[PDB]
């Protein structure tokens, strides 16, 4: 019945409309479902007192129609009043849009982010690390180890090696996970080379993971560098498992390549 | 763990996809 | 079996076609001829 | 009691400087209380009976200026006020003669599905009472069949009120109607019969139709031109569509799916 | 099954208080549940059959009237079948046959 | 609950009449079909046809 009052040109009746387009949005959802869609008219009409709320009620109404890109573009263009509420049955409806579209966008941004990159909204990436702070702050880290893979981002994953969860062997068995679920070489060696440098910058430098990564990684000089750190440290008992896992699990050509860096 | 529960379960969707195409091939090949 | 989940609550057909054409027409068509003998 | 209006509403102020203060006065109704069903505070109806009378007279003068799109704004608001199941006036001297007046203009708007939909509204008010709104449904009902002169008899009987703005669109919808179906198997007609069935004896309106279409002005003559010969005798379009359909047979005849 | 029963049970007085809501059932994605256990589908096609009946789409209605008729069990208490047996040839009397 | 759909059948009734008579007879006056169809008016007997 509030569909009739859309030719007023006093925009205060339109904000009286969106005053009624949010709270009782389910019974007239039947009524105006596909009939009238003048959200963009006042949302773009410089009689603004309705723009930063206008895309909210469109993002409500198109949901059970489907229209996840309609309510997703309006979810990004809805501003501060949209994401301010997470105490409903609607935050699950919108992060399943935005986080999924963000990470399947970031598959392309793992392919080609350089050149023809996409205009990622700061909320499109902002509720990513915001809800990721909900992951870090809501005590769950078998998932907070996971969404950091899902965003295809290295430095947030390197960031959460030091969190409210500790490292007994945590963040080490996660590479036993990622080695199993690992897709290609391209994402593999990038995370692989960056974790084993804070493994050397760790208090007790683990040797079997930095040997295993390097035969998984083809660095014929870094094992001569930490091998120089173990000759400089001068204990062949800890210069042992770094070297016989190397002889056991390395290639013949890889040892014939690393041998020059050992002897020099 | 819960993180492997989805990736290792779509892994058998990739593993699952090939087989109907396979019996699709053998469906004509056993005829001819 | 035969449950009907309930939300709300020959001998005949050739005869029924005789009713379909001659539903209510000339039922006692017996004396109209003798009534047309003098009018026709 | 925030009334502001009770002096100039009954007297004819035809599209004068009452309409803008009137619409902003309805805006002042909106700033005080929403035109919502107000299920809480049922006693309070200052927002319902008074503002509903104001909104129905505001619907009423909308036709006096030919405000066609904003007519159904106020009128749709009235119908949604009779959507309210609250104890108010079951009806008035306006609910029939305005709601079925909306039925009478929609009857002209040439939307018959929306014409019939509203019949859930008043199931008992159709025939058994409410002759004034029985008149549009019998009217468009007569527009269904070949009833023509009886429609002009309903132009001899407009009992409720003027209905002039709607019976003039009813004029026009007869004008294009038999301006269209004058083109039938009408073998020859003098300048009397088809002349005086519609409206026009001898103005140059008969030149407007007789030269707009054919049926040329002749020696007391309506010329029956009728070819109806060219478009039949095609095997080729059946030899294209049907040749498609034979392959559409053979797909679901031999090939396993 | 929330796709299924929540639309007849939605419909049951929306028809009795219907007007324009029907177009919502036209644009409804959940018109199909694709399986509704031989009876909710069966009466479902009838509940949407009277929709096109009352909103004047005749020939499309009568085939789902028939399809809604021919999917009902072998039980005797049949008042809804008394209803569809009537309305099924209401619309055919609207169509001449 | 069907009376508002029962009320519109007279269109189909007169289609039945004009199809029946138009099929049956071949050269009939319009001043006979309105009386046989009890139409009370031959002036729109041109118009329904």
Swiss-Prot record, chain A:
It comes from the Eukaryota. Signal peptide: none annotated. Transmembrane segments: none annotated. Component of the 19S proteasome regulatory particle complex. The 26S proteasome consists of a 20S core particle (CP) and two 19S regulatory subunits (RP). The regulatory particle is made of a lid composed of 9 subunits, a base containing 6 ATPases and few additional components including PSMD1. Interacts with ADRM1. Interacts with ZFAND1. Component of the 26S proteasome, a multiprotein complex involved in the ATP-dependent degradation of ubiquitinated proteins. This complex plays a key role in the maintenance of protein homeostasis by removing misfolded or damaged proteins, which could impair cellular functions, and by removing proteins whose functions are no longer required. Therefore, the proteasome participates in numerous cellular processes, including cell cycle progression, apoptosis, or DNA damage repair. Belongs to the proteasome subunit S1 family. This is 26S proteasome non-ATPase regulatory subunit 1.
UniProtKB/Swiss-Prot annotation, chain B:
Belongs to the AAA ATPase family. It is found in: Cytoplasm; Nucleus. This is 26S proteasome regulatory subunit 6B. Component of the 26S proteasome, a multiprotein complex involved in the ATP-dependent degradation of ubiquitinated proteins. This complex plays a key role in the maintenance of protein homeostasis by removing misfolded or damaged proteins, which could impair cellular functions, and by removing proteins whose functions are no longer required. Therefore, the proteasome participates in numerous cellular processes, including cell cycle progression, apoptosis, or DNA damage repair. Component of the 19S proteasome regulatory particle complex. The 26S proteasome consists of a 20S core particle (CP) and two 19S regulatory subunits (RP). The regulatory particle is made of a lid composed of 9 subunits, a base containing 6 ATPases including PSMC4 and few additional components. Interacts with NR1I3. Interacts with PAAF1. Interacts with TRIM5. Interacts with ZFAND1. It comes from the Eukaryota.
From Swiss-Prot, chain C:
InterPro entries: DSS1_SEM1. Pfam families: DSS1_SEM1. Expressed in limb bud, craniofacial primordia and skin. Component of the 26S proteasome, a multiprotein complex involved in the ATP-dependent degradation of ubiquitinated proteins. This complex plays a key role in the maintenance of protein homeostasis by removing misfolded or damaged proteins, which could impair cellular functions, and by removing proteins whose functions are no longer required. Therefore, the proteasome participates in numerous cellular processes, including cell cycle progression, apoptosis, or DNA damage repair. It comes from the Eukaryota. PANTHER family: 26 PROTEASOME COMPLEX SUBUNIT DSS1, 26S PROTEASOME COMPLEX SUBUNIT SEM1. It is found in: Nucleus. GO terms for biological process: double-strand break repair via homologous recombination; mRNA export from nucleus; proteasome assembly; proteasome-mediated ubiquitin-dependent protein catabolic process. Keywords: Nucleus, Proteasome. The lineage of its organism: Eukaryota, Metazoa, Chordata, Craniata, Vertebrata. Coiled coil: none annotated. CDD domains: DSS1_Sem1. Belongs to the DSS1/SEM1 family. Signal peptide: none annotated. GO terms for cellular component: cytosol; integrator complex; nucleoplasm; proteasome complex; proteasome regulatory particle, lid subcomplex; protein-containing complex. This is 26S proteasome complex subunit SEM1.
UniProtKB/Swiss-Prot annotation, chain E:
The lineage of its organism: Eukaryota, Metazoa, Chordata, Craniata, Vertebrata. It comes from Homo sapiens (Human). The gene is PSMD3. Belongs to the proteasome subunit S3 family. This is 26S proteasome non-ATPase regulatory subunit 3. Component of the 26S proteasome, a multiprotein complex involved in the ATP-dependent degradation of ubiquitinated proteins. This complex plays a key role in the maintenance of protein homeostasis by removing misfolded or damaged proteins, which could impair cellular functions, and by removing proteins whose functions are no longer required. Therefore, the proteasome participates in numerous cellular processes, including cell cycle progression, apoptosis, or DNA damage repair. Component of the 19S proteasome regulatory particle complex. The 26S proteasome consists of a 20S core particle (CP) and two 19S regulatory subunits (RP). The regulatory particle is made of a lid composed of 9 subunits including PSMD3, a base containing 6 ATPases and few additional components. Interacts with UBQLN1 (via ubiquitin-like domain). Interacts with ERCC6. The chain holds residues 245 to 341 of 534 of the full protein.
């Amino acid at each position: 019945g509030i569909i009739s009052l859309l030719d007023e040109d006093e925009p205060q009746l339109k904000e009286f409309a969106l005053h009624k387009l949010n709270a009782v949005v389910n019974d007239f959802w039947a009524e105006i479902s596909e009939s009238v869609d003048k959200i963009e008219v006042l949302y773009e009409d410089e009689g603004f007192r309705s723009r930063q709320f206008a895309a909210l009620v469109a993002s409500k109404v198109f949901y059970h129609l489907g229209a996840f890109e309609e309510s997703l573009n309006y979810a990004l263009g809805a501003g501060d009043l949209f994401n301010v509420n997470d105490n409903s049955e609607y935050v699950e409806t919108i992060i399943a849009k935005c986080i999924d579209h963000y990470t399947k966008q970031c598959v392309e941004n793992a392919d080609l982010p350089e050149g023809e990159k996409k205009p990622i909204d700061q909320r499109l990436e902002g509720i990513v690390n915001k809800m990721f702070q909900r992951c870090l702050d809501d005590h769950k880290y078998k998932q907070a180890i996971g969404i950091a893979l899902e965003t295809r981002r290295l430095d947030v994953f390197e960031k959460t090696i030091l969190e409210s969860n500790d490292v007994p062997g945590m963040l080490a068995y996660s590479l036993k996970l990622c080695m199993s679920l690992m897709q290609n070489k391209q994402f593999r060696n990038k995370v692989l080379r960056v974790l084993v440098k804070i493994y050397m910058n760790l208090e007790k430098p683990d040797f079997i993971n930095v040997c295993q990564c390097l035969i998984f990684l083809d660095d014929p000089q870094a094992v001569s560098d930490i091998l120089e750190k173990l000759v400089k440290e001068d204990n062949l008992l800890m210069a042992y498992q770094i070297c016989f896992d190397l002889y056991e699990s390395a290639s013949q050509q890889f040892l014939s390549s690393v041998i020059q860096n050992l002897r020099t | 763990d819960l993180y492997s529960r989805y990736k290792k379960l779509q892994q058998e969707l990739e593993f699952l996809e090939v087989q109907e195409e396979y019996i699709k091939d053998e469906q004509k090949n056993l005829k001819k | 079996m035969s449950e009907k989940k309930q939300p709300v609550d020959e001998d005949n057909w050739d005869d029924d076609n005789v009713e379909d054409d001659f539903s209510n027409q000339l039922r006692a068509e017996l004396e109209k001829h003798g009534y047309k003998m003098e009018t026709s | 009691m925030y009334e502001q209006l009770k002096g100039e509403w009954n007297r004819k102020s035809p599209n004068l400087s009452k309409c803008g203060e009137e619409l902003g006065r309805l805006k002042l109704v909106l700033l005080e209380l929403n035109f919502l069903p107000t299920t809480g505070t049922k006693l309070t109806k200052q927002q319902l009976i008074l503002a509903r009378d104001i909104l129905e007279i505001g619907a009423q003068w909308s036709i006096l200026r030919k405000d066609i799109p904003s007519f159904e704004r106020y009128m749709a608001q009235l119908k949604c006020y009779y959507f309210d199941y609250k104890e108010q006036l079951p009806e008035s001297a306006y609910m029939h003669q305005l709601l079925g007046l909306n039925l009478l203009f929609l009857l002209s708007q040439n939307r018959v599905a929306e014409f019939h939909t509203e019949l859930e509204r008043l199931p008992a008010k159709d025939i058994q009472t409410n002759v004034y709104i029985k008149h549009p449904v019998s009217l468009e009902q007569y527009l269904m069949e070949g009833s023509y002169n009886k429609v002009f008899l309903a132009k001899g009987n407009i009992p409720a009120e003027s209905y002039t703005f709607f019976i003039d669109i009813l004029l026009d919808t007869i004008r294009d109607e038999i301006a269209g179906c004058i083109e039938k198997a009408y073998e020859k007609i003098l300048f009397t019969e088809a002349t005086r069935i519609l409206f026009f004896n001898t103005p140059k309106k008969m030149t407007d139709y007789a030269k707009k279409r054919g049926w040329v002005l002749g020696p007391n003559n309506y010329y029956s031109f009728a070819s109806q010969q060219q478009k039949p005798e095609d095997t080729t379009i059946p030899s294209t569509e049907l040749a498609k359909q034979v392959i559409e047979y053979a797909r679901q005849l031999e090939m396993i799916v | 099954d929330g796709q299924a029963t929540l639309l007849n049970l939605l419909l049951r007085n929306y028809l009795h208080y219907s007007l324009y809501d029907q177009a919502e059932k036209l644009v409804s994605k959940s018109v199909f549940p694709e399986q509704a256990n031989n009876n909710e589908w069966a009466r479902y096609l009838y509940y949407t059959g009277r929709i096109k009946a009352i909103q004047l789409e005749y020939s499309e209605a009568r085939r789902t009237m028939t399809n809604a008729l021919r999917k009902a069990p072998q039980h005797t208490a049949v008042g809804f079948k008394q209803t569809v047996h009537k309305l099924l040839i209401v619309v055919e009397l609207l169509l001449g046959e | 609950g069907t009376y508002t759909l029962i009320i519109r059948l007279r269109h189909n009734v007169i289609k039945t009449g004009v199809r029946m008579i138009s099929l049956s007879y071949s050269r009939i006056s319009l001043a006979d079909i309105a009386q046989k169809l009890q139409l009370d008016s031959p002036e729109d007997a041109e118009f329904i046809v």
